[PDB]
């Protein structure tokens, strides 16, 4: 059974522990390892870390050469308007693969990395909402294990771990608190949530053994609140486009979280810099929820017509439309996995985050007509959405 | 639930009946309407109908013009090495869409088609093994309804309906008889099976009302037994390529059906031309099953290494492989839909009525053996779908 495998995989190897490793850096950080620089949140994390630290940022990247790796990283940041050529000296591509033993490094390379790196931001992961647990085991479970291995190899390296609110159970009335313990593995639906649950369990055990860690759980990470930068292969963009093209949207009961990526990246970096954050968990979600009917109002205001249907009737219309439209069919696959009220969605409390960030000026943008206009304007500009009539 | 809708959709509109329509042709067939000429079975059915009849073959096809329609039909046949230019005079594209009212025709066009066509071979359908019932309702349920409408409009037109063994429940031990009544809708799993069950119910009610109908249920339709012609986006091809690329295949306990397309198309046409076939149902399946371990033997003999694993372990290796391979991921989607150790439930069909009806013909299903599998694999290698064995 999958929960058997999850429980077995959540046991952290005995040798991953402080042992005789040298103490963590207490002075200025010289070097930082970032995983996930070729992803969405990763692009913003990388640019932010360059702005807010003086460290060389080692970036794990799958590539045949270091130049190819640098090219992947540059193009990714370029796609979000985050690149400037002055960043290149700050970036050290590290050829490797989060889904491989030792992050894809030879024993010698791994040992060297274990000597050079002062701190780790682990944002690398395989995110696939269709695949089973076993498809993401290598990248999410073993990859996190190997990061924990690096963090305890040679000398201790603080770990700022990017998890997800999806490690939390659905169907709760009251907003889940940042300090509530994790439930059992059967509380989760889908391979992604399952793999991230196991990953966070490993990280929490390394914490219990003395590794300094921060656990950051982002909610639904949306577009940049000013530029509108947003990868269009995102399921949220997929869904919005589907509704626009069909001219109909669902009424759902769920409180909707939309958390702009610039808030998530700034909060991760801010929190990672606070010694008070060690051993702590933070919910990087929008403190202000929005209702679906409000979302559709904002989208109509931008200029898109949207009839509203009960979720089950909406899903039925999607099913019908999928007959002749393979893109709508693709969207349907995501939604047919698990009624009237629509899908359950996790609601989080973020009290500890709000407090920890109070003197920072790091604050989550509101979801309002203006934010949605910024988002839709960018999607139209980039050819993803047809401009409103 | 979906079964309520299925039952509702299986009710055939009252006006689709013989009424005052003129009697069917009792002489030579002058014209035939074929749906599905742009698909895999449809290509062979078209080429076979040209050889065995001297009727003009009207072919329903989505296109902006008849000439572009002809191009689509021609190219499809070319892809299976079925095209020769002497076919061209025989084919008449009809611009249209199985998933639209009146097959996408105007009232005037539909009335004209209702005057011209002597008989209908209905092989058009949306086949998607991932989508729900509602995604295939238009093409499979309403499309079949509209075909029945045409078959009863103006003058009676016999209907040779291509259904599927997937209208039958899976997991039953004894070969299901061709004359066994359909069970209720709750027996079926997946949108494709559900939509074809409803379609066949509609066709049966038409038959009950006096429309001459043959119901043909193909099994798992595989490559041409001589040329190896086989549509590579087919799920069976996907699965075999996945096994080859991983180097591992599942031990499943099913009695595997592999029914070459040249047998299905020849049997359809043969059976359609027997008046004894009217009102009858035929299972166009291979009379001889193959076991999975025989399949892997045939593939090793061709040159591909295959370790064998229990189905659950094989499926887990597929999932693991899918992490870094999107094609294997695509294959995994199909197999995960089921929430036992011997692998997927499959249907076993009796074909005794087909065997008898074809006994005086030269139509017999090829055996599954190392030679057939070599024919299939050789074609896939030649077309670049598979890497040649080491």
Automatic annotation (TrEMBL), chain B:
Binding, NADPH: 38-41, 62, 72, 97-99, 123, 125, 192, 196
Coiled coil ranges: none
Similarity comment text for this entry: Belongs to the ATP-dependent AMP-binding enzyme family.
Protein's UniProt name: MxaA
UniProt lineage: Bacteria, Pseudomonadati, Myxococcota, Myxococcia, Myxococcales
Full protein stretch here: 1120 to 1513 of 1515
